[PDB]
Design a protein around this ligand. Structure first.
Ligand SMILES: [Ca+2]
Length: 140
């Protein structure tokens, strides 16, 4: 069990109907608060660990938005070393309905060190996710 990783929150700007459920709601420790993106499609969020910082990812945990758990199916998690994710690799693909009101934990088996990680949401989701956490260790 490796430590939870910290970084700068990156991703889609804004929120649905300008209510204020921005990407930051996925990193606040509250499973009741969620990201609700401004558009149905294209929403994403994640971390930049910082210039010169690369982590090997060993585990990801996530919690869906309550009542909208199906909006995570088909979402993927990616690691990259370009902020545009053009070099990205998929670390995990959500294929089953996540349980409500809890963190689902998934193992990652990829030895690559990444500066950037993200959740890339499927069409029709508004990016909906309540909490997102990455675990791992500095790349050797
Ligand atoms: Ca939250």
């Amino acid at each position: 069990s490796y430590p939870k990783l910290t970084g700068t929150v990156i991703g889609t700007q804004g929120s649905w109907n300008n209510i204020g459920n921005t990407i930051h709601k996925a990193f606040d420790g509250d499973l009741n608060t969620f990201f609700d993106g401004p558009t149905a499609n294209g929403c994403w969020l994640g971390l930049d660990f910082g210039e010169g910082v690369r982590n090997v990812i060993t585990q990801i945990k996530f919690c869906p938005r309550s009542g909208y758990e199906q909006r995570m199916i088909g979402g993927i998690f990616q690691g990259a070393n370009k902020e545009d994710f053009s070099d990205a690799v998929t670390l995990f693909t959500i294929t089953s309905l996540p349980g409500s009101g809890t963190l689902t934990s998934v193992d990652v088996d990829n030895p690559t060190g990444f500066r950037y990680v993200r959740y890339l949401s499927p069409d029709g989701s508004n990016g909906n996710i309540a909490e997102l956490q990455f675990f791992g260790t500095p790349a050797g």
